[PDB]
């Protein structure tokens, strides 16, 4: 049917551009030029990362940027496009440094999207930068507007969407026309500050990129898979802070959306969106991660899993102690909590001491380091089988990731996803999703279809009864009833009827 989106972001910091070259791997690890032929032919959509907004309140490049040499990197991205016609260069603004809640530029974002009047500035700027650099569309990574900030910040949305369909009239670009996306958050905690008004912010995008990953880090007690798929029993459980949410529900409905505790996994925060009216699963993005995420401290009897560590949280990382043992990457970067795919590989070839193991509930792989206490969660080409299959059977958009320079030299797992959307000799339909534990909460939007003896005046209806009515089934809260269903608080609308 319609092509899955692959949305791959290209993460370049201030000082590689203003040093860009193709052929130092110390001074720029992953070079346009790593983006093939064959690369470009496997992504929808390049997301180059990461432009800010300044204290002006407009869309602009980190002013330390050389603006020669950025514009020099955009064309190398947007010249890909000639090998295809489907590929976007969008431009991200934002990111945890730039607008985290303590972010180096967080009061601009708050600032732009305050009034009408900063939000016609900042909107137009977006698209002045858009076209400026050639760019095909506007991506929003703000980590995360609060309650209190979401009106303005849907509201920035809705003018920069007007304003993206005015420059598609105005180059004839009905074909390929520009986008606007958000990267959104990928669990129930910050989902919270905007969930109630998500058929809001979702209407004006092309795509929400869920980012469905950093699950488990160094800021939670216990280690855990940072992007399981389903739930295990065994692993944490989290406060569902969705249940709190200001969304004028009943006892009823929030506890058959809200289940708490629950398993913190990507289904978890892809079912949270479908649940709610007027988000679409067409325009749902599921991230997947290019990264793993290590501890160290770890304690032994199943693998590392669920266990307490010792992994510092600060930033920059408090000392020199690179102990993930072969990440050479780590050593450059100076910080043993993160590796890339590319990194991972290496490890686990070399003589460093990792066991490759896998948990079936979760559908992810993770490495154990027996001798030294290490644990590390990440993803691969088999547990993207899994989350590729969840993509088609969900009716997704697509899948995201971050980020390209984490692939391995020869691009694997952009790869593999391109084969489990794209090839034709390509087979799931025996692959076993497995028992893990799945998010059962059910709102609005998600309204399985059932079947219900219609509804009948004058019967007695005792607790549970479940009767179709007026298009929908529904389900007494307690007994007896008689009302009609929909006309009183006793009848909980619990299914859809096929038409
Ligand atoms: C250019 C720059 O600011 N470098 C910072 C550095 O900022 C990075 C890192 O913190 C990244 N962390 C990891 C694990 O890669 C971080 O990546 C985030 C990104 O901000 C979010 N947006 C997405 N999208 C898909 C849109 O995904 C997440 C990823 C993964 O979590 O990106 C920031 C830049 O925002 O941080 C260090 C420490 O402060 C700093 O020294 C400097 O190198
Ligand atoms: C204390 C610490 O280590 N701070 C890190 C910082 O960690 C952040 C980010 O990695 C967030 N990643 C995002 C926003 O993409 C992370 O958010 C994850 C989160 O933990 C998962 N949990 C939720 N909940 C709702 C609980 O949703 C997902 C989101 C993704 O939507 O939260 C941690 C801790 O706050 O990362 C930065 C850059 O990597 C690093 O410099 C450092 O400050």
Redo the contacts with the bound molecule.
């Keep these: 049917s319609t092509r899955k989106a692959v949305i791959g972001y290209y993460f370049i910091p201030t000082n590689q551009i203003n040093n860009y070259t193709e052929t130092d791997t110390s001074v720029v690890p992953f070079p346009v030029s790593n983006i093939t032929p064959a690369k470009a032919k496997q992504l929808t959509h390049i997301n180059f990362s990461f432009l800010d907004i300044n204290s002006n309140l407009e869309c602009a490049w980190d002013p330390a940027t050389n603006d020669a040499k950025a514009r020099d990197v955009v064309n190398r991205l947007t010249a890909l496009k000639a090998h295809n016609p489907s590929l976007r260069i969008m431009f991200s603004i934002g990111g945890?440094?730039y607008s985290?809640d303590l972010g180096v530029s967080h009061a601009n974002y708050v600032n732009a999207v305050k009034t009408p009047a900063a939000r016609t500035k900042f909107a137009q700027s977006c698209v002045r930068i858009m076209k400026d650099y050639g760019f095909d569309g506007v991506d929003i990574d703000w980590?995360?507007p609060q309650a209190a900030e979401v009106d303005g910040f849907i509201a920035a949305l809705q003018e920069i969407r007007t304003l993206l369909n005015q420059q598609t009239i105005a180059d004839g670009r009905q074909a390929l026309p520009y986008q606007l996306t958000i990267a959104?958050?990928?669990?129930?905690?910050?989902?919270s500050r905007y969930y109630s008004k998500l058929a809001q912010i979702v209407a004006p995008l092309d795509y929400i990129n869920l980012?469905?990953?950093?699950?488990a880090?160094?800021?939670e007690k216990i280690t855990n898979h940072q992007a399981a798929l389903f739930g295990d029993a065994a692993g944490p459980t989290?406060y569902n802070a969705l249940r709190e949410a200001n969304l004028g529900w009943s006892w009823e409905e929030l506890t058959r959306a809200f289940p708490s505790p629950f398993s913190?996994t990507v289904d978890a925060a892809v079912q949270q969106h479908l649940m709610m009216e007027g988000v679409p699963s067409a325009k749902i993005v599921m991230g997947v991660p290019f990264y793993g995420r290590a501890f160290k401290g770890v304690s032994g009897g199943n693998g590392g899993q669920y266990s307490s560590h010792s992994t510092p949280?600060?930033?920059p990382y408090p000392n020199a102690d690179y102990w993930l043992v072969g990440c050479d990457e780590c050593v450059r970067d100076k910080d043993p909590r993160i590796a890339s795919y590319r990194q991972l590989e290496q490890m686990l070839q070399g003589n460093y001491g990792y066991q490759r193991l896998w948990n079936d509930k979760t559908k992810t792989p993770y490495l154990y380091h027996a001798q030294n206490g290490l644990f590390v969660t990440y993803d691969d080409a088999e547990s993207f089988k899994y989350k590729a299959k969840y993509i088609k059977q969900q009716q997704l958009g697509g899948v995201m990731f971050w980020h390209l320079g984490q692939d391995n030299r020869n691009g694997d797992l952009l790869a593999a996803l391109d084969r489990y959307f794209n090839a034709a000799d390509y087979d799931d339909s025996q692959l076993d999703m497995g028992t893990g534990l799945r998010y059962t909460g059910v709102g609005p939007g998600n309204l399985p279809i059932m079947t219900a003896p219609a509804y009948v005046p004058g019967t007695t209806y005792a607790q549970g009864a479940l009767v179709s009515y007026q298009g929908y089934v529904w389900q007494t809260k307690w007994g007896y009833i008689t009302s009609a269903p929909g006309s009183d608080s006793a009848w909980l609308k619990v299914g859809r009827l096929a038409a």
């Design positions: 945890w440094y985290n980590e995360y959104g958050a990928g669990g129930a905690f910050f989902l980012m469905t990953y950093d699950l880090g160094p800021w989290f913190l949280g600060e930033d």
